[PDB]
Amino acid sequence: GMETLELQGAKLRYHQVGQGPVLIFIPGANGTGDIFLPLAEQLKDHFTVVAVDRRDYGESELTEPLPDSASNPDSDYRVKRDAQDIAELAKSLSDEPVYILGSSSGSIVAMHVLKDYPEVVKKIAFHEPPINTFLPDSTYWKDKNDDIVHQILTEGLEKGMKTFGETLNIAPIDAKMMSQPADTEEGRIEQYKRTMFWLEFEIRQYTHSNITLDDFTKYSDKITLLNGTDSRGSFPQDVNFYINKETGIPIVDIPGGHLGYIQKPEGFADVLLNMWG
Amino acid sequence: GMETLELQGAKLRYHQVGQGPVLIFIPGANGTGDIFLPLAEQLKDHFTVVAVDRRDYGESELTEPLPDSASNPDSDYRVKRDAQDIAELAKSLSDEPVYILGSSSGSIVAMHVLKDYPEVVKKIAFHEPPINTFLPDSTYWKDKNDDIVHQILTEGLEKGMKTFGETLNIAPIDAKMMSQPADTEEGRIEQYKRTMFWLEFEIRQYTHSNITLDDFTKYSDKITLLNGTDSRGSFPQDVNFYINKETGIPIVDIPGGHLGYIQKPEGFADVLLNMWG
Ligand SMILES: OB(O)c1csc2ccccc12
Numbered sequence: 302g303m304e305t306l307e308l309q310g311a312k313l314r315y316h317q318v319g320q321g322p323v324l325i326f327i328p329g330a331n332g333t334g335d336i337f338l339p340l341a342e343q344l345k346d347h348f349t350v351v352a353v354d355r356r357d358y359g360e361s362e363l364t365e366p367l368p369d370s371a372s373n374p375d376s377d378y379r380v381k382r383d384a385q386d387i388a389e390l391a392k393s394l395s396d397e398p399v400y401i402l403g404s405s406s407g408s409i410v411a412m413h414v415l416k417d418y419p420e421v422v423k424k425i426a427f428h429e430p431p432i433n434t435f436l437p438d439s440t441y442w443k444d445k446n447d448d449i450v451h452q453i454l455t456e457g458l459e460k461g462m463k464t465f466g467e468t469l470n471i472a473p474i475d476a477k478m479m480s481q482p483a484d485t486e487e488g489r490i491e492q493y494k495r496t497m498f499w500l501e502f503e504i505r506q507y508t509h510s511n512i513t514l515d516d517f518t519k520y521s522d523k524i525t526l527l528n529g530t531d532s533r534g535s536f537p538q539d540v541n542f543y544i545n546k547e548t549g550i551p552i553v554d555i556p557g558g559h560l561g562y563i564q565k566p567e568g569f570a571d572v573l574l575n576m577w578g
Numbered sequence: 579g580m581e582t583l584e585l586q587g588a589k590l591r592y593h594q595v596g597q598g599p600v601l602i603f604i605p606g607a608n609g610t611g612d613i614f615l616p617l618a619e620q621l622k623d624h625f626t627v628v629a630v631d632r633r634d635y636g637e638s639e640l641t642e643p644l645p646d647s648a649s650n651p652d653s654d655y656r657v658k659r660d661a662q663d664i665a666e667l668a669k670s671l672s673d674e675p676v677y678i679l680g681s682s683s684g685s686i687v688a689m690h691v692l693k694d695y696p697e698v699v700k701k702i703a704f705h706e707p708p709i710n711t712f713l714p715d716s717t718y719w720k721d722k723n724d725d726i727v728h729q730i731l732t733e734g735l736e737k738g739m740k741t742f743g744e745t746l747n748i749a750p751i752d753a754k755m756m757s758q759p760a761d762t763e764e765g766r767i768e769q770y771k772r773t774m775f776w777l778e779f780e781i782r783q784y785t786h787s788n789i790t791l792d793d794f795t796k797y798s799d800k801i802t803l804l805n806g807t808d809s810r811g812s813f814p815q816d817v818n819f820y821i822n823k824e825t826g827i828p829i830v831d832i833p834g835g836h837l838g839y840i841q842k843p844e845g846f847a848d849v850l851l852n853m854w855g
Pocket residue numbers: 462463465466469471479480496607
């Protein structure tokens with residue numbers, strides 16, 4: 302459907318309509334070129350209009366993961382790579398410098414195209430740029446951006462998992478260990494990533510997955526249910542009590558809490574050896 | 579020093595220590611086998627202990643993207659693939675069925691190993707399972723997992739972006755359009771994933787990127803600043819006013835607001851044609 306330009310680390314997809322000199326539209330927050338298509342129809346008699354899906358969005362696809370440092374708020378990897386994508390797109394489509402319009406965060410991509418690859422720019426428009434770096438009050442706006450990201454991404458996660466743990470009657474030691482911040486700032490970014498992945502891709506999917514009581518009954522002789530000695534009253538123990546009630550499969554108590562295997566490894570092992578050694 | 583097993587779609591990494599019959603530990607929310615290493619030390623004289631990084635975590639790596647459907651909350655792709663990984667690992671390390679212990683969400687993986695690959699299971703233990711599907715009050719626990727995810731992913735973003743838009747004095751028409759819930763359930767999932775990505779990886783990095791006014795004065799003759807006529811008073815217009823004040827680069831007014839190119843594509847095009855056609 303869309304056109305493709307294969308670049309280092311990505312397949313860049315774009316829409317193309319019209320005839321005449323090339324005019325590249327760079328999208329803002331939505332990331333995709335489809336938002337420009339009604340506009341392109343109005344221009345297609347005068348320009349070859351090109352509307353880009355920036356490489357992290359839409360029908361574009363990465364061919365290798367983002368660098369770990371891209372999560373750093375001062376990383377320049379993505380904005381420069383987006384600008385290089387536009388410059389390479391222009392060079393692929395035109396032997397002459399081209400017309401470029403970016404809007405909002407796409408206007409910032411456009412500014413980096415002019416800075417890094419001026420040779421591809423005939424004319425350029427910055428539609429409502431939100432860049433703050435050169436403003437006299439840059440700090441105020443930078444701090445507002447930093448704080449809203451921190452509120453939505455970090456604060457929301459921290460507060461939600463605390464109250465969720467309490468509603469499930471998770472023991473304090475488990476709540477602390479499952480939430481404990483990594484000792485390194487490289488580890489804390491991974492940890493956020495891992496926890497958000499688990500929330501979006503694991504908790505709902507796994508806890509409501511296709512296991513029935515009859516699955517337990519059929520292999521009852523193979524199964525041990527384990528409840529921690531330090532996590533009594535918590536929701537997972539009620540799950541085991543229900544399995545036991547309906548199947549007769551024994552519950553064995555084992556030292557520690559939800560994370561008892563690392564809290565009390567000697568005692569945890571002693572029970573496993575009684576079971577299976 | 580971790581071991582590796584190449585499987586469909588992933589390189590599965592795992593710790594291996596000890597001697598004796600194979601005992602595989604499946605981690606829960608942390609996703610990684612290292613949390614079992616102190617326990618492994620206590621068991622290594624009786625078992626070949628195998629502590630897995632499940633394929634989406636730790637030193638494991640995917641070799642092809644997750645299916646687009648994995649973000650759906652009723653997807654079963656990941657749990658079934660995790661169970662298949664454990665069964666394939668078991669077969670690679672042992673000709674006999676093996677001992678398996680999973681904890682928390684990893685106990686759910688263990689349950690699916692027993693259900694779909696009982697032939698690899700000698701004995702199995704479910705440590706503090708949080709699965710709710712077969713519970714008499716499953717709806718209660720399921721809707722609560724769904725709610726905690728919705729609160730952290732969706733509502734925190736909704737509420738934050740609303741306040742953010744008031745700090746930036748974004749026009750109501752643009753606020754509504756940039757936040758409008760998509761018309762399909764899957765479109766809403768993609769929409770919030772895209773905004774979360776933009777918040778972590780774009781807003782801070784791009785708006786405080788290294789652009790100076792000197793970068794514009796070098797090519798002042800090629801640059802047009804565009805202000806929407808329906809977005810007066812908003813922060814991006816102030817950015818354009820500062821650029822124009824300091825550099826003399828012209829501001830051209832254009833129909834619509836921050837999203838004017840799709841709000842009023844005919845009027846937007848008319849101005850571009852005046853500029854450049
Ligand atoms: O704080 B966490 O990241 C976490 C992971 S699993 C679980 C279960 C109950 C409460 C919190 C948690």
